[PDB]
Amino acid sequence: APRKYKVYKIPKRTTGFRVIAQPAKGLKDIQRAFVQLYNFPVHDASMAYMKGKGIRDNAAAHAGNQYLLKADLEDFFNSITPAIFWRCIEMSDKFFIEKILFWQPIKHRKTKLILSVGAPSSPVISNFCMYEFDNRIHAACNKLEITYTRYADDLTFSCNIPNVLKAVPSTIEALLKDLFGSELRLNHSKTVFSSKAHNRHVTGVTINNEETLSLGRDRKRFIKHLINQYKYGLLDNEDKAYLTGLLAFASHIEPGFITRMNEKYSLELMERL
Amino acid sequence: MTKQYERKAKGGNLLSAFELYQRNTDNVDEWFETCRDYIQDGHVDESGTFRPDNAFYLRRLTLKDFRRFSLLEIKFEEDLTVIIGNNGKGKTSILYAIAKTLSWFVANILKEGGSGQRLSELTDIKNDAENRYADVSSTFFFGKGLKSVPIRLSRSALGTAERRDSEVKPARDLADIWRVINEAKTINLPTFALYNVERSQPFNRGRREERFDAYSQALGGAGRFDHFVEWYIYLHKRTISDIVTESVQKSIVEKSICSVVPSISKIWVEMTTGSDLVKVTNDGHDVTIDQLSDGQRVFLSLVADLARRMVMLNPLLENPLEGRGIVLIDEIELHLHPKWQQEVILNLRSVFPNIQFIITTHSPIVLSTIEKRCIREFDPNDDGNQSDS
Amino acid sequence: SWFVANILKEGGSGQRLSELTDIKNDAENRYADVSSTFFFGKGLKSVPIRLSRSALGTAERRDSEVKPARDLADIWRVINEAKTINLPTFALYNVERSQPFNAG
Amino acid sequence: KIWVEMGSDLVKVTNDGHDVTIDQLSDGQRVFLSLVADLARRMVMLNPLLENPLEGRGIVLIDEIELHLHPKWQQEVILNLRSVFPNIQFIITTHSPIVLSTIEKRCI
Amino acid sequence: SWFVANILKEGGSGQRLSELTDIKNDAENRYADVSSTFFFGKGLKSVPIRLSRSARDSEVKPARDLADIWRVINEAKTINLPTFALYNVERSQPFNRNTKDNAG
Amino acid sequence: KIWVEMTTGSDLVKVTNDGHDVTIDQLSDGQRVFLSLVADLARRMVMLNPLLENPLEGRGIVLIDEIELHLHPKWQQEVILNLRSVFPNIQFIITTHSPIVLSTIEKRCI
RNA sequence: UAGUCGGGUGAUUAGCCAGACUCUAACUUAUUGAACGUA
Ligand SMILES: Nc1ncnc2c1ncn2[C@@H]1O[C@H](COP(=O)(O)OP(=O)(O)OP(=O)(O)O)[C@@H](O)[C@H]1O
């Protein structure tokens, strides 16, 4: 149900906590069944929370560009409400859909209905809400030779032609106010411009100055200190599993790094882990 | 997660190291040292000037719907940024917003959970705006560890039933680090000042020897030359003796004042009468501060407040004037003869080197030797209501 | 003063201690507490209060704990507003009362 | 344009095309407005028989006339003052030598 | 100020020079003299007035006479009085924003 | 009694109240009032008696309403032990509520 | 000059090679959810 959620805190990698609301099991299954019953329109540029297309593809969409820009939607999930969903459906019996889809974080606000990050159905509705937003933004971008993707609160644009992304921020805002009234809003504090002169990266994947995806020198040094420790067996159980997971991540994003690590010490060492 | 914070702090992330300090041994000897050396490390370069290993300095301001502006961005140069325009554009609103964002730093170094200044729901939101709320977003920088410290002083318009929370929590966190580390062991704190037009006032006629009175009425606009005179008399009384860091503080402020202000060559305190008044050797004639002119008095009431706030806020720094901070000045040309206007900044940013001066002016002759990277210029036609020079 | 502030106005914040005078100058603690217990009838035989004040630059904001006294004062105010009830008469008289000597 | 808007009687001025208040006015716009409106009031009150009270007489002193004023505005302050106060004697001190360019050397 | 005061009421007395600040610090005489000279057109023409202050009196009679003439003439019938005004940096002040009803 | 400036950065008054060396703020309020009265009288009498070896031996009339105001009984029992010995030639006209001060005054002077 | 990308040595540091620079990085969130692995 809308109130059938459980709230908790998960910490942050630097300081502070984040508040999550995982649904109950029965409504979890009900919303999964609803997701299966009707598939929602989704734009290709939304390379997040879909089969196959992962972080690597979203970051590689901008590999072959030298000027990078992006903005972060302010309070993405919690802004979506019944009105946004139904306007999106109309633009292209219904009360139980409202009940199943949404969350009520306040005991008194029966109408304060929003998507939670925990909800397994939240990704599908989030992608569905911006089907025309992505349509128009990508149409404009490709009209001006701009590659645009969105990793779920990370609207990324890239291009090679100088002084074109400058108008893109404003564009975004305008379109937003046409589509979702004035409810969902951008985060002007996070908007970042970068070039081949600074530290570009999309969704955590670094983009080096040679138009290839990379783990970044930071990690490439961190999980090689970890490997040098494993060489002398100075890790632990959880730490060793952490190194294994990080090596798997580096294999997925930058297989060349794994090959070079193998050449560094051996093949059997990484088969062991 | 002791492990993830451990990894971050070992990388160099200051926030994770401080969080480890707040969990271990505090209900450790390693993470406390990391956090303190992060905010205490530095080197003396060729020019004999202490330089931080991590520099604290504003980086970006974004005024969304704030007074005249509907959107603006200033890459505060890290060190000197003179916003040259002319009346009606908003060079005072920028410093007002910056001071009100630094007020949270000051409030949360005064006391955890403190409260800083706030935008106004009557005079800070653009009247033509459709949002009916103003947002002063900002981002500071404090080194590789805390490369980005966001803040957002936001305020809705009076009568609109839609508040707008302010995101000051990162400021709370960084100020928490400063204050807690200062308590555990003495460190050097950041200086924050606002010298707007209100610093021009008649020379009318707390303990003043603390270290946290450097923050009293620091972002109001006038400074406190009353407090400076009181504290300087205090220093004189405490350091006559034979005729001590009080003596060194006194000498530092004396040299600062006698160097920045050209008319003033000496300054001391006399009590051969029953008054205990300050004498200034202005223009070669010994006088009192009441007898000083309007441009020899503010040019003193600025440098004196700054030097005071920076000797008794950077106690361990060999030269306290080299400490860090963010100083706003709203009209550097106030009451100053044009010849004075032509060398104000060249000397102001020569005895306060590591300070980020966000200065504003309308006299194009202030920008005499100032590099073009430091100048932000609202075009007379393309007025300030558009997102440099 | 807290009882007065809360009986008069809802959420009223009575007088607070002073960081400049109401803290012992020589105290390793670096905060001052003024705790006090009250007795109001057979029920609520112990209404506590603390007025705390810490110097500037201390890690924990040593804070007054005035919740129960505020609750009792709010009970006074609410029950008085509903029906008239005689209320406490707090007063102070120092050596300053030796001083020479609007219908609303 | 300057007018009074009714229920707290705000003074509204069309500054640079936008209706602001004396609070939402620069430090030079408001200071010049003060130094002008004060004289306007004084002379309207002390010259009740003149059909144009601004023509009255007197001595008006202004120290640092260029205070809170950018160079363009410095270049035309005294001239406008003399145009609205033809007969008032004006004794004006200053330190910025770009207001002198619009006066005769007789008055320096 | 003498001219101004002597118009409000008969025998007024305008301000005088300060003793601490208005006298030259190195003066060999220890007193300051300010000798002004106005022209009232051609009717009364010259009008001297000298203020003084020691660390010495002031001859202010001509101003008293001229202001008395203005005052009596205005009392008998309305005239146009002069406008004496000074503006210093103290006009640079925040807009108080606090209106007051002074009842005429 | 001294003034301590050239220490503590402020000017404080210091006394030897009861053998201590304290600040005058630690003195009892009644002692402070009596101190102010005595100092005022001494200053006035040294101003008005320039040609005199001890100016305190000058003439005059001093009135004191409630000489024992705010003074603890232990101080009342010593107030008037030195008024005449230090101000011989001045007529004191005092009024009082306390008998403890009367235990030091003759009936001739009551 | 500065920042930045991240090829090897050495062991999250230091330090040697490359390089490129629209006014213009700031490495994020777990148990949901994708993607990696593992079993
Ligand atoms: N709430 C507001 N709404 C609309 N315009 C405003 C508002 N606040 C200020 N302004 C604008 O500010 C302008 C005055 O300039 P401002 O005071 O902001 O800085 P400045 O003039 O450059 O520097 P200083 O005030 O020190 O002289 C007004 O003309 C007015 O148009």
Ligand SMILES: [Mg+2]
């Ligand atoms: Mg002046």
